[PDB]
Amino acid sequence: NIDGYFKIYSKHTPINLVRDLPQGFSALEPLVDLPIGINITRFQT
Amino acid sequence: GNYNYLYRLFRKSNLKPFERDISTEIYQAGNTPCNGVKGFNCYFPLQS
């Protein structure tokens, strides 16, 4: 959040692993950019 | 009287550009810590 801009970048990657992060380099393209402009301090899944 | 346009009278620190402050808690302008809603050196943060 820079000046309240809630930036969302995601990518799908087919992998074959069991317990660890994939070995390699992966990017993230912009899915959506949100100008929400609200105060954020703590999150939850 | 157009008293509806309230405004903050005090502030603990100089706020940032495009920063919005709505909380109306009583400011502790005095040396001593303060609580409650009223008291000397304990003034309403907003004026009209």
Curated annotation (Swiss-Prot), chain B:
Superkingdom per UniProt: Viruses
Impact when changing Q47N: Reduced host ACE2-binding affinity in vitro
Effect of L6R: In strain: Delta/B.1.617.2, Epsilon/B.1.427/B.1.429, Kappa/B.1.617.1, Lambda/C.37, 19B/501Y, Omicron/BA.4, Omicron/BA.5, Omicron/BQ.1.1; Contributes to cellular immunity evasion and increases infectivity
Region annotated Receptor-binding motif, chain positions: 1-48
Region Disordered: start-end pairs: 9-44
Variant or mutagenesis effect after changing F44L: Increased resistance to neutralizing antibodies and human covalescent sera neutralization
Residue ranges of the region described as Immunodominant HLA epitope recognized by the CD8+: 2-10
Result of altering F40P: In strain: Omicron/XBB.1.5, Omicron/EG.5.1
SS bond partners: C34-C42
Result, substituting L6R: Increased resistance to neutralizing antibodies. Decreases HLA binding to NF9 epitope. Increased binding affinity to human ACE2
Outcome recorded upon mutating N14K: In strain: Omicron/BA.2.75, Omicron/BQ.1.1, Omicron/XBB.1.5, Omicron/EG.5.1
Reported function: Attaches the virion to the cell membrane by interacting with host receptor, initiating the infection. The major receptor is host ACE2. When S2/S2' has been cleaved, binding to the receptor triggers direct fusion at the cell membrane. When S2/S2' has not been cleaved, binding to the receptor results in internalization of the virus by endocytosis using host TFRC and GRM2 and leading to fusion of the virion membrane with the host endosomal membrane. Alternatively, may use NRP1/NRP2 and integrin as entry receptors.
Subunit organization: Binds to host ACE2. RBD also interacts with the N-linked glycan on 'Asn-90' of ACE2. Cleavage of S generates a polybasic C-terminal sequence on S1 that binds to host Neuropilin-1 (NRP1) and Neuropilin-2 (NRP2) receptors. Interacts with host integrin alpha-5/beta-1 (ITGA5:ITGB1) and with ACE2 in complex with integrin alpha-5/beta-1 (ITGA5:ITGB1). May interact via cytoplasmic c-terminus with M protein. May interact (via N-terminus) with host bilirubin and biliverdin, thereby preventing antibody binding to the SARS-CoV-2 spike NTD via an allosteric mechanism.
Name of the molecule in the record: Spike protein S1
Gene responsible for this protein: S
Full protein: residues contained: 447 to 494 of 1273
